[PDB]
PDB file of N, CA and C in Angstrom:
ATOM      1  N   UNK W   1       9.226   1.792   6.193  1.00  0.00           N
ATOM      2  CA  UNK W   1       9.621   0.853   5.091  1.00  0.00           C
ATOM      3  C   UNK W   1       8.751  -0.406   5.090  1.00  0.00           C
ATOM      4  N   UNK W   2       8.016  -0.847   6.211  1.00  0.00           N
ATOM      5  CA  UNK W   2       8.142  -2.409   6.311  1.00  0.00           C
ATOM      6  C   UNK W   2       5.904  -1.855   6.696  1.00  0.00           C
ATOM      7  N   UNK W   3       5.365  -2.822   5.841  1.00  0.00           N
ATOM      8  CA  UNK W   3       3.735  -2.142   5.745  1.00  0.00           C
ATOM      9  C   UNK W   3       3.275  -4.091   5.960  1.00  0.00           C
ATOM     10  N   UNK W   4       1.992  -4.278   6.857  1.00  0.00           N
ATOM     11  CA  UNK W   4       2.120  -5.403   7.639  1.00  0.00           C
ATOM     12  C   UNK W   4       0.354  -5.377   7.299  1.00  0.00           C
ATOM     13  N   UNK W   5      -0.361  -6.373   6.860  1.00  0.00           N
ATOM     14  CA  UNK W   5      -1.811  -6.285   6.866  1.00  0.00           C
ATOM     15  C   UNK W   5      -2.235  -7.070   8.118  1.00  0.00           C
ATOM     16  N   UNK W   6      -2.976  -6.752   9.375  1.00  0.00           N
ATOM     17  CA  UNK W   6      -3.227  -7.103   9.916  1.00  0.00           C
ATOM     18  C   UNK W   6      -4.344  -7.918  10.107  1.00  0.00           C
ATOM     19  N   UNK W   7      -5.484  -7.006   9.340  1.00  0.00           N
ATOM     20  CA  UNK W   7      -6.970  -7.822   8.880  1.00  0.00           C
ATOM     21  C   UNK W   7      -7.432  -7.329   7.828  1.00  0.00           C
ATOM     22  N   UNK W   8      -8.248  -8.008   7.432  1.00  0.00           N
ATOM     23  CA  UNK W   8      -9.362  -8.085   5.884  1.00  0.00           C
ATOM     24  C   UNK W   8     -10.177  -8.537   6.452  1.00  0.00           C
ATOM     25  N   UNK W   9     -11.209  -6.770   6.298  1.00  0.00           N
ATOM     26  CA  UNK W   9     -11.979  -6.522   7.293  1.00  0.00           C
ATOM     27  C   UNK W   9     -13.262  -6.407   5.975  1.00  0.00           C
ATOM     28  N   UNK W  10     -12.974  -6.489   4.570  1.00  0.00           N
ATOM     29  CA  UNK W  10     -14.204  -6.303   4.217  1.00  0.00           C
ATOM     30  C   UNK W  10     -13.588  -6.502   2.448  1.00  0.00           C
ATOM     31  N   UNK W  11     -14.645  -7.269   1.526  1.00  0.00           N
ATOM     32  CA  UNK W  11     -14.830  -7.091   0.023  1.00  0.00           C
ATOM     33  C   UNK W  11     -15.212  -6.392  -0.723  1.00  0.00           C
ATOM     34  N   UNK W  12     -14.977  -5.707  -2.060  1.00  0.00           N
ATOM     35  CA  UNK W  12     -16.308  -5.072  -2.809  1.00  0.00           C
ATOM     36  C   UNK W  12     -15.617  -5.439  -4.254  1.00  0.00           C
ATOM     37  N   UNK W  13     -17.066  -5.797  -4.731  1.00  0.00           N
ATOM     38  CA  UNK W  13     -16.781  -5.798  -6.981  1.00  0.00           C
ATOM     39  C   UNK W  13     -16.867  -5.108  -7.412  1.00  0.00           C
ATOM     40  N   UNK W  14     -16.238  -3.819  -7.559  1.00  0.00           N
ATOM     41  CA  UNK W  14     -17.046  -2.608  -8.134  1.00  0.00           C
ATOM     42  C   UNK W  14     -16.064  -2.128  -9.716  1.00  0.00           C
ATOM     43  N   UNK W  15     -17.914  -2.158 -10.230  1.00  0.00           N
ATOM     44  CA  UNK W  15     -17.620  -2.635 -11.959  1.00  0.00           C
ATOM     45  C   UNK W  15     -16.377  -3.168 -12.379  1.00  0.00           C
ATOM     46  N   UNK W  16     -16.706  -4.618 -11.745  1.00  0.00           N
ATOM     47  CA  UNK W  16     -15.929  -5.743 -12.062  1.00  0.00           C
ATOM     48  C   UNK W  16     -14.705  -6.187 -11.201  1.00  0.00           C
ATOM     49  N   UNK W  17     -13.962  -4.911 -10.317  1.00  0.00           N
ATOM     50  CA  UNK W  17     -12.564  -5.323  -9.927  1.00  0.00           C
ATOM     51  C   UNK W  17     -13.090  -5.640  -8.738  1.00  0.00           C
ATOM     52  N   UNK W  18     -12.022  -6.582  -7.979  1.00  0.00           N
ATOM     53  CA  UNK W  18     -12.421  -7.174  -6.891  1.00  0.00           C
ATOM     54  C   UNK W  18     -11.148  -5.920  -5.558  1.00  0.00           C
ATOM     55  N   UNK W  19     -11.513  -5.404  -5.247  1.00  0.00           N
ATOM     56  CA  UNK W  19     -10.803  -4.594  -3.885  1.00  0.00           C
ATOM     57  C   UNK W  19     -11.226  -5.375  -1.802  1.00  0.00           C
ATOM     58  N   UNK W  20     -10.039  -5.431  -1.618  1.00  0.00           N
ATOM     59  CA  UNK W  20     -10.173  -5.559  -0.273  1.00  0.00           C
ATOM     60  C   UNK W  20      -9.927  -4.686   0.800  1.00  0.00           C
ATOM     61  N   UNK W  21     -10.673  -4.224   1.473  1.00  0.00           N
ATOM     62  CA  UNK W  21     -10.406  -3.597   2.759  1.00  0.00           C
ATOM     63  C   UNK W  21      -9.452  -4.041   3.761  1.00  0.00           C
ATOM     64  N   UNK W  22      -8.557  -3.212   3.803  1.00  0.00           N
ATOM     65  CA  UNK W  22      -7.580  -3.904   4.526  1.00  0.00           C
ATOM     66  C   UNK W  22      -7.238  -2.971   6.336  1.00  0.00           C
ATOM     67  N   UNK W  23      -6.720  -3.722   7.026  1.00  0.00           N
ATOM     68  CA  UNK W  23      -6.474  -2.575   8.576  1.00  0.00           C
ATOM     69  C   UNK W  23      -4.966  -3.015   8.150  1.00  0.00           C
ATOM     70  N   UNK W  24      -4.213  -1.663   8.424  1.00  0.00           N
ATOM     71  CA  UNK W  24      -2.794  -1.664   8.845  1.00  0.00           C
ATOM     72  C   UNK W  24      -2.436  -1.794  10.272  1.00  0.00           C
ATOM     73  N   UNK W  25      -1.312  -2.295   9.870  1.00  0.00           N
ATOM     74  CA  UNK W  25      -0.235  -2.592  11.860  1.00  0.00           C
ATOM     75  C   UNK W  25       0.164  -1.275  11.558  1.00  0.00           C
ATOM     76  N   UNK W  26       0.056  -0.586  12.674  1.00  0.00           N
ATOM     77  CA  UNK W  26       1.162   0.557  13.187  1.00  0.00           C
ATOM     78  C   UNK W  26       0.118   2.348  12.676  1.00  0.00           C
ATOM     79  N   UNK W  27      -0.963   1.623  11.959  1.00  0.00           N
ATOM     80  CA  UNK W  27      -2.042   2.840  11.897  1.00  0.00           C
ATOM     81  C   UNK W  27      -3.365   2.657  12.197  1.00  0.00           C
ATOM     82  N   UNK W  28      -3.921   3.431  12.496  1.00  0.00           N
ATOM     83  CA  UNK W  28      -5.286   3.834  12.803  1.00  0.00           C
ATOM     84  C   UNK W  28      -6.026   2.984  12.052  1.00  0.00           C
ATOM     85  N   UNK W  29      -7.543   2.764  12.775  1.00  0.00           N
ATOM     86  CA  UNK W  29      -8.517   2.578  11.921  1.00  0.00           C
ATOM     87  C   UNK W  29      -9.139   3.689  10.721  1.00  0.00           C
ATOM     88  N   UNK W  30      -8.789   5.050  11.187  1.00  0.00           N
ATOM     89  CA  UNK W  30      -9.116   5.787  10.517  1.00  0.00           C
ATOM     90  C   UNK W  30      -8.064   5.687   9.029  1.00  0.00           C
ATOM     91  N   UNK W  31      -7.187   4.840   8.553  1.00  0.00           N
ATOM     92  CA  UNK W  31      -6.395   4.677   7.708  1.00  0.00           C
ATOM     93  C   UNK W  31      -6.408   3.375   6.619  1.00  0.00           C
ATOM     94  N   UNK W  32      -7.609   2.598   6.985  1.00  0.00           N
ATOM     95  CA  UNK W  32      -7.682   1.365   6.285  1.00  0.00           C
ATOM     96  C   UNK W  32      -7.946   2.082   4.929  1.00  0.00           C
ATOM     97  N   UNK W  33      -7.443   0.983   4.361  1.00  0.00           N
ATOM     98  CA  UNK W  33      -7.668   1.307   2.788  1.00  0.00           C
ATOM     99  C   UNK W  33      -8.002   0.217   1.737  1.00  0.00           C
ATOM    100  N   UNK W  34      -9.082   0.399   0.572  1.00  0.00           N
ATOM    101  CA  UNK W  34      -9.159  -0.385   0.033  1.00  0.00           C
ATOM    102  C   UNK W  34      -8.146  -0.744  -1.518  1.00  0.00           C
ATOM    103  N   UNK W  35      -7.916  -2.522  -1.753  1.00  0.00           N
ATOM    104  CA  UNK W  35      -6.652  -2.644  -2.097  1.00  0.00           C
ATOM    105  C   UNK W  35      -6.950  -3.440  -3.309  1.00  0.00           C
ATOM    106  N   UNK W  36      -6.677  -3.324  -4.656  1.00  0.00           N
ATOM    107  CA  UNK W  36      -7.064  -4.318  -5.354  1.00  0.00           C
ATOM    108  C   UNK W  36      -6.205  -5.852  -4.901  1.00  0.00           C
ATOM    109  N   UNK W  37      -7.149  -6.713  -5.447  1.00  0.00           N
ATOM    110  CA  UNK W  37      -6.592  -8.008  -5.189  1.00  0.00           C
ATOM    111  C   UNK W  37      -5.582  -8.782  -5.757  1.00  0.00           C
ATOM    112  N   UNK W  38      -5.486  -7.936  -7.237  1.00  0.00           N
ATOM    113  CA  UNK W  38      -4.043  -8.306  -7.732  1.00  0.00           C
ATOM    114  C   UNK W  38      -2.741  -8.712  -7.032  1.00  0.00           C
ATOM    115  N   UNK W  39      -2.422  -7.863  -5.936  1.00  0.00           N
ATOM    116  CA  UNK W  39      -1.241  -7.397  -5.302  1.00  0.00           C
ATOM    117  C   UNK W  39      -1.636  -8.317  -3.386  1.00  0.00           C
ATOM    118  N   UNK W  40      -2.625  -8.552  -3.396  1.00  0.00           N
ATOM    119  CA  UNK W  40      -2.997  -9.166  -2.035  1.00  0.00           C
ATOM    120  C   UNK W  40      -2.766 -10.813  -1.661  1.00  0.00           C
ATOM    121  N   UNK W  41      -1.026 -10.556  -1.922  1.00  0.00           N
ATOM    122  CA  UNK W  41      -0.891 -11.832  -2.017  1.00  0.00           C
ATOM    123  C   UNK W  41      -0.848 -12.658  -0.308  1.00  0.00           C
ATOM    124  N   UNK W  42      -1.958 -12.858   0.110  1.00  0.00           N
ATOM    125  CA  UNK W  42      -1.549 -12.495   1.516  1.00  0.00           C
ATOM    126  C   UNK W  42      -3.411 -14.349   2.203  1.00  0.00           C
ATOM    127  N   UNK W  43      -3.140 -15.380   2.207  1.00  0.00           N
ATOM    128  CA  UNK W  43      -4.272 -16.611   2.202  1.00  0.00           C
ATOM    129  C   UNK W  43      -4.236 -16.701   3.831  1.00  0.00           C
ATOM    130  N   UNK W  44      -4.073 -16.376   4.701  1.00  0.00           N
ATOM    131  CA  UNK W  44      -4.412 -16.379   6.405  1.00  0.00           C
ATOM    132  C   UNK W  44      -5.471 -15.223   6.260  1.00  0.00           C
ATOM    133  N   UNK W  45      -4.603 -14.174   5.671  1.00  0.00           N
ATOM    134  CA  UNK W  45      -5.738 -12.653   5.941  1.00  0.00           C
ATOM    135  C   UNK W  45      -6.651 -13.380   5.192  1.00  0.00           C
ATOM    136  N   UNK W  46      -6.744 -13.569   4.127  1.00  0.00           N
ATOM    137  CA  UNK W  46      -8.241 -13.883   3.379  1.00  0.00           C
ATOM    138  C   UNK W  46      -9.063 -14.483   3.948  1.00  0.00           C
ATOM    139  N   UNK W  47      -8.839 -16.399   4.028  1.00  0.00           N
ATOM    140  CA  UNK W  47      -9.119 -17.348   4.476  1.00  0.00           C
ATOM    141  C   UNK W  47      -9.700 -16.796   5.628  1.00  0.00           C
ATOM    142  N   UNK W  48      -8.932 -16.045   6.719  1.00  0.00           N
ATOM    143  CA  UNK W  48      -9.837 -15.475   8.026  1.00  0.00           C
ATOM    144  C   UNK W  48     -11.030 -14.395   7.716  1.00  0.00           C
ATOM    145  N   UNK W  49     -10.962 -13.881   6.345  1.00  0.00           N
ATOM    146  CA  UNK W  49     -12.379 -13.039   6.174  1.00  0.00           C
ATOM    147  C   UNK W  49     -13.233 -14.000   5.331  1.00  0.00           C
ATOM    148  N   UNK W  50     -13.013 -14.874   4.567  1.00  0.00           N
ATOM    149  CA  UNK W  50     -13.792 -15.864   4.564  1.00  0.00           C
ATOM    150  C   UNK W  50     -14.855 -16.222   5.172  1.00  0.00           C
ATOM    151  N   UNK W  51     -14.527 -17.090   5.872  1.00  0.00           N
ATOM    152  CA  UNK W  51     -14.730 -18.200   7.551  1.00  0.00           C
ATOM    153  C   UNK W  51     -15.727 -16.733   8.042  1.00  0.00           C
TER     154      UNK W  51
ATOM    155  N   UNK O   1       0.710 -10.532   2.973  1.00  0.00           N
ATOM    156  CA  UNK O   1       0.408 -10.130   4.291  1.00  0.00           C
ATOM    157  C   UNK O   1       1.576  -9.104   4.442  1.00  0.00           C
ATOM    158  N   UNK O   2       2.346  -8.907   4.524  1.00  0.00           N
ATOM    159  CA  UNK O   2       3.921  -8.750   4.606  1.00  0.00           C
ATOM    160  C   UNK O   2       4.259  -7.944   3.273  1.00  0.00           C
ATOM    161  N   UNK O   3       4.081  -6.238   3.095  1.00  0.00           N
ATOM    162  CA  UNK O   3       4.903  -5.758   2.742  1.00  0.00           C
ATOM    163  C   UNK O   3       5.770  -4.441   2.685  1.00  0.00           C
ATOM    164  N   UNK O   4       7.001  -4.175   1.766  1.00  0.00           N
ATOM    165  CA  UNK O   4       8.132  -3.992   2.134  1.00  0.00           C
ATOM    166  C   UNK O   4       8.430  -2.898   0.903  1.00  0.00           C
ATOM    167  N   UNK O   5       8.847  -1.434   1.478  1.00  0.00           N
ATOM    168  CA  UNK O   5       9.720  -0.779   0.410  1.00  0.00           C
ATOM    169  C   UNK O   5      10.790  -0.850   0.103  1.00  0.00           C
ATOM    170  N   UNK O   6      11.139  -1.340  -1.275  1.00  0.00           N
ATOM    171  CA  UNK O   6      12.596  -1.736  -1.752  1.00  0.00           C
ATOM    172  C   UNK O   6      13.424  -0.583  -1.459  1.00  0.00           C
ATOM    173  N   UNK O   7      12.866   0.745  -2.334  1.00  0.00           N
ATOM    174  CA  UNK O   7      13.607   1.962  -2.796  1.00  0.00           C
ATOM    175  C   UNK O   7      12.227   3.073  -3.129  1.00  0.00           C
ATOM    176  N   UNK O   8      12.465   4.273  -3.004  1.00  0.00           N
ATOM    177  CA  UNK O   8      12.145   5.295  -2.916  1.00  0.00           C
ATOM    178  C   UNK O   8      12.736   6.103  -4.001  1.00  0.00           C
ATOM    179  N   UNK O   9      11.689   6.156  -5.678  1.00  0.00           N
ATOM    180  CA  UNK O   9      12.604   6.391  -6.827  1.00  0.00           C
ATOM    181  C   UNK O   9      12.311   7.963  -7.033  1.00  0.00           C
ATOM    182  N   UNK O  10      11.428   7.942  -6.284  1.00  0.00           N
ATOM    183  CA  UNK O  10      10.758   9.656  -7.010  1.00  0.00           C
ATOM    184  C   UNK O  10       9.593  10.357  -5.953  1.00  0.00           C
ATOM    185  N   UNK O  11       9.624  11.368  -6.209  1.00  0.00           N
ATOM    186  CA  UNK O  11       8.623  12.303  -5.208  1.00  0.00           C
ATOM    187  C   UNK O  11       7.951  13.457  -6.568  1.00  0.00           C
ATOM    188  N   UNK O  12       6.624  13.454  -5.920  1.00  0.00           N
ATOM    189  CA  UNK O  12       5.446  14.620  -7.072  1.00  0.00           C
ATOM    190  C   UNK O  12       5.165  15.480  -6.189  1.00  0.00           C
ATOM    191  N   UNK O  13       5.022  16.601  -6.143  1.00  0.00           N
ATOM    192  CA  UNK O  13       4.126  17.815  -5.683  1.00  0.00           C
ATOM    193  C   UNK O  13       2.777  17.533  -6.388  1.00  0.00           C
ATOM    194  N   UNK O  14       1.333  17.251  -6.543  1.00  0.00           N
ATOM    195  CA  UNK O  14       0.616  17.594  -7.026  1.00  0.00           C
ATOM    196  C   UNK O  14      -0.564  18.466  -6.603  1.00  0.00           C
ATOM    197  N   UNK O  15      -1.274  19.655  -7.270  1.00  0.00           N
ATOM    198  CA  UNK O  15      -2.123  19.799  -6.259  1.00  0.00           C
ATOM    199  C   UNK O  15      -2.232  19.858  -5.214  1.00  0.00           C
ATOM    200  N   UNK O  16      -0.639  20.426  -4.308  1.00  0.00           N
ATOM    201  CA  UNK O  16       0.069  20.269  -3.275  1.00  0.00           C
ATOM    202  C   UNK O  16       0.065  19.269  -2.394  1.00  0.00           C
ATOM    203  N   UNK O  17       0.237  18.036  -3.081  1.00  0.00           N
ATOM    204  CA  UNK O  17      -0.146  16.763  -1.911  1.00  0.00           C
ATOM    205  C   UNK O  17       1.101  15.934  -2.505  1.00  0.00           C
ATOM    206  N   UNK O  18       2.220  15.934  -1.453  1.00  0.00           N
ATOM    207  CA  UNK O  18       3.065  14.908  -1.622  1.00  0.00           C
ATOM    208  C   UNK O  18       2.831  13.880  -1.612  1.00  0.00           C
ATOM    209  N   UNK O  19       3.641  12.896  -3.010  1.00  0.00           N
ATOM    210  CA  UNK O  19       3.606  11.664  -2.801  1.00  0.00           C
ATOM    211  C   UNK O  19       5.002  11.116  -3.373  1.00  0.00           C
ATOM    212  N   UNK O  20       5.388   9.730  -2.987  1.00  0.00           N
ATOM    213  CA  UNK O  20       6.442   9.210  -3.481  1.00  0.00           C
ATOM    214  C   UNK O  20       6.282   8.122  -4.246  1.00  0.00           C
ATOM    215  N   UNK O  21       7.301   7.845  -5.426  1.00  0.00           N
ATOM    216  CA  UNK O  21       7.131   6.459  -5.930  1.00  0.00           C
ATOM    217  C   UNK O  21       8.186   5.418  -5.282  1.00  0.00           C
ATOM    218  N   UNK O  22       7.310   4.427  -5.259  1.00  0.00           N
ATOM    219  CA  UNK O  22       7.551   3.584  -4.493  1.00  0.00           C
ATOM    220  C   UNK O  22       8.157   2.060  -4.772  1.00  0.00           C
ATOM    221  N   UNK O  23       9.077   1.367  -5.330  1.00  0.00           N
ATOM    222  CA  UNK O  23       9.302  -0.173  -5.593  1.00  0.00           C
ATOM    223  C   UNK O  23       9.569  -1.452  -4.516  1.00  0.00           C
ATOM    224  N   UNK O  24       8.635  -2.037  -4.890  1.00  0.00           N
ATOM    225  CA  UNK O  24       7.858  -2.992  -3.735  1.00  0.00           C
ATOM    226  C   UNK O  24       8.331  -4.297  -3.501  1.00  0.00           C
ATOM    227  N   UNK O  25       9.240  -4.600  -2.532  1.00  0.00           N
ATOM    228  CA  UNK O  25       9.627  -6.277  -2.645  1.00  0.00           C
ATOM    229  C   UNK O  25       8.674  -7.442  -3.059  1.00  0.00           C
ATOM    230  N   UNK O  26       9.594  -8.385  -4.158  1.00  0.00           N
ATOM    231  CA  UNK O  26       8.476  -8.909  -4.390  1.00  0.00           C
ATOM    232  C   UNK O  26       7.676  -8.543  -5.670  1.00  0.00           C
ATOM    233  N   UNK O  27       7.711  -7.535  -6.000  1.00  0.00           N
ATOM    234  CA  UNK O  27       7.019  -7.507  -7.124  1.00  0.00           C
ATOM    235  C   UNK O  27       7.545  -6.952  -8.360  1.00  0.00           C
ATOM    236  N   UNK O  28       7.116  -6.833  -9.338  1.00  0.00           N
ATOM    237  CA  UNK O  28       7.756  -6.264 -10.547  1.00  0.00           C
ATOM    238  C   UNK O  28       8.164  -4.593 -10.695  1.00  0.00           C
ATOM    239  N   UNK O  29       8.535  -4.106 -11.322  1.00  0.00           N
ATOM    240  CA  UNK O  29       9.018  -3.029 -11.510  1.00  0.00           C
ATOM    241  C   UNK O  29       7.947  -1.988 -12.158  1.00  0.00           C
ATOM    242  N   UNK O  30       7.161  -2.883 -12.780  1.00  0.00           N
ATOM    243  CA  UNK O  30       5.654  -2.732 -13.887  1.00  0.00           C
ATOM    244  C   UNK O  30       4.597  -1.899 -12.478  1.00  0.00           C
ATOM    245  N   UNK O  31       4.447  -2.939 -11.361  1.00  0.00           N
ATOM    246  CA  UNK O  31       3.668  -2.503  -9.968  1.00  0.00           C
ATOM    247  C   UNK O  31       4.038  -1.465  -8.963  1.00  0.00           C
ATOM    248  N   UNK O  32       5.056  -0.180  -9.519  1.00  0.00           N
ATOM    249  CA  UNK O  32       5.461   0.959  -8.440  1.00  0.00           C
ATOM    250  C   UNK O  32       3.837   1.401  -8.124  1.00  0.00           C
ATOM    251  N   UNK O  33       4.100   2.104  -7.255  1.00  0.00           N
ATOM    252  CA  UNK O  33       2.720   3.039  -6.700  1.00  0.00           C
ATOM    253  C   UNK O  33       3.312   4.419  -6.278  1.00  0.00           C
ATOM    254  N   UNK O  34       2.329   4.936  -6.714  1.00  0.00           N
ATOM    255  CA  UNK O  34       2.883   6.609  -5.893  1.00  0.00           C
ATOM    256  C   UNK O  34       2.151   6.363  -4.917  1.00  0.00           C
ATOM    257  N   UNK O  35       2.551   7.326  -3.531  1.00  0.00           N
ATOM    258  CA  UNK O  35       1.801   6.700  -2.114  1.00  0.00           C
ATOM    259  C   UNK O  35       1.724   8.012  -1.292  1.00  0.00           C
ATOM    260  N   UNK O  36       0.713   8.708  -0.981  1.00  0.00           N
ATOM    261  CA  UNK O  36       0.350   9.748  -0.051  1.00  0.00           C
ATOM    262  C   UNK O  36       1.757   9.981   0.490  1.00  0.00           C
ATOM    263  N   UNK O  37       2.682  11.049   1.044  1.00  0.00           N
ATOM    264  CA  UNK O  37       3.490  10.762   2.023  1.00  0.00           C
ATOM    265  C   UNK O  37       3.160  10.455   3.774  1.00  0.00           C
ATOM    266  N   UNK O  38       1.769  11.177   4.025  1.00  0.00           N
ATOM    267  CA  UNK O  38       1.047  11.394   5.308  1.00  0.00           C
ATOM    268  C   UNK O  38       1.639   9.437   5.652  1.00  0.00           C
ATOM    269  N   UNK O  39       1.573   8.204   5.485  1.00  0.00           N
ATOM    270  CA  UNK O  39       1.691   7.025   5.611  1.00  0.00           C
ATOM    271  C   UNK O  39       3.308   6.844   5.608  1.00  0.00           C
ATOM    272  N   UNK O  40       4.123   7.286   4.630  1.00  0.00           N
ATOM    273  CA  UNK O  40       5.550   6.895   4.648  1.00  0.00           C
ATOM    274  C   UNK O  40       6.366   7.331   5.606  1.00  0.00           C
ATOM    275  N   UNK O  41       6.277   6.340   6.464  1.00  0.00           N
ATOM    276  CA  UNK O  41       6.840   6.530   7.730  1.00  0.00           C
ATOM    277  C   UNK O  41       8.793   5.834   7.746  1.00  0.00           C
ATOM    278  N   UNK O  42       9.335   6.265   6.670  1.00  0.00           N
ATOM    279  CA  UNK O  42      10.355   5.442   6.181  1.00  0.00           C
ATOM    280  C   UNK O  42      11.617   6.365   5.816  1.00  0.00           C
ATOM    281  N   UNK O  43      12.420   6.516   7.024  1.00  0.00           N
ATOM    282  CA  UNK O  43      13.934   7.473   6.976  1.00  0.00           C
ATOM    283  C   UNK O  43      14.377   7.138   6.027  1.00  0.00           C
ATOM    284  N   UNK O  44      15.096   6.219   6.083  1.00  0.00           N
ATOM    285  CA  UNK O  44      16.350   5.106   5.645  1.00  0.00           C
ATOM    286  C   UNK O  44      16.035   5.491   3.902  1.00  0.00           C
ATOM    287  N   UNK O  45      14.832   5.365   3.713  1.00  0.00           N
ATOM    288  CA  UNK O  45      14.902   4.864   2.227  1.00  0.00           C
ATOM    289  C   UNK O  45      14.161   6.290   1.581  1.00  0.00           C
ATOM    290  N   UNK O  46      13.900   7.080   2.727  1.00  0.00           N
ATOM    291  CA  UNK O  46      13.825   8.578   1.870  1.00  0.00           C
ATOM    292  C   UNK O  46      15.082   9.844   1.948  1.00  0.00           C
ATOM    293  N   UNK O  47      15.649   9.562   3.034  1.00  0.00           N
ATOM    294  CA  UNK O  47      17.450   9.932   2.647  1.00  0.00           C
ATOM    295  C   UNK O  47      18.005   9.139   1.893  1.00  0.00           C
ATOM    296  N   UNK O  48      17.920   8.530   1.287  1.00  0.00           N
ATOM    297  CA  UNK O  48      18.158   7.319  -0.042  1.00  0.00           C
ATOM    298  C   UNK O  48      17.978   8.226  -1.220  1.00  0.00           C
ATOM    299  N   UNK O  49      16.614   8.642  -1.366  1.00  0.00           N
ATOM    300  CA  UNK O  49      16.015   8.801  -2.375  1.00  0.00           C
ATOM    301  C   UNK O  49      16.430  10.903  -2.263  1.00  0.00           C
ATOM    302  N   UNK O  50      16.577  11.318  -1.381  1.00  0.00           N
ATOM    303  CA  UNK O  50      17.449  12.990  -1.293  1.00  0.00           C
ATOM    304  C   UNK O  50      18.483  13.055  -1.882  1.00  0.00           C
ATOM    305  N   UNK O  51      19.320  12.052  -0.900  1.00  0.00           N
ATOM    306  CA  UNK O  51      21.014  12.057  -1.515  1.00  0.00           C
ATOM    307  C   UNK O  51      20.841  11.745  -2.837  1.00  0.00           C
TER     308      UNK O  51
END
């Protein structure tokens, strides 16, 4: 039930939308997924891929 | 950073790849997602969605 972003590990613009790479708590690296930014309401994760 | 399945409204067979729809704390009703099941690691709210 409960989905936790741990890091934002990476950006891309592709034709036009902005998506973030994200790592999940409780899965694999083999499971990151990229996320549009609409819904990434989430300024520590960012701010730390920022920087 | 932080999120959360409300409710568990619906399940697809497609192309034999389960997925469920999904309503997301926090967000509108407009933003469900259907979601791989291989990731929904979530009893509670898929005996919810059986019964």
């Amino acid at each position: 039930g409960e989905y936790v972003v741990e890091k934002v590990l990476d950006r891309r613009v592709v034709k036009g939308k902005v998506e973030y790479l994200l790592k999940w708590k409780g899965f694999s690296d083999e499971d990151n997924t990229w996320e549009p930014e609409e819904n990434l309401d989430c300024p520590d994760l960012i701010a730390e891929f920022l920087q």
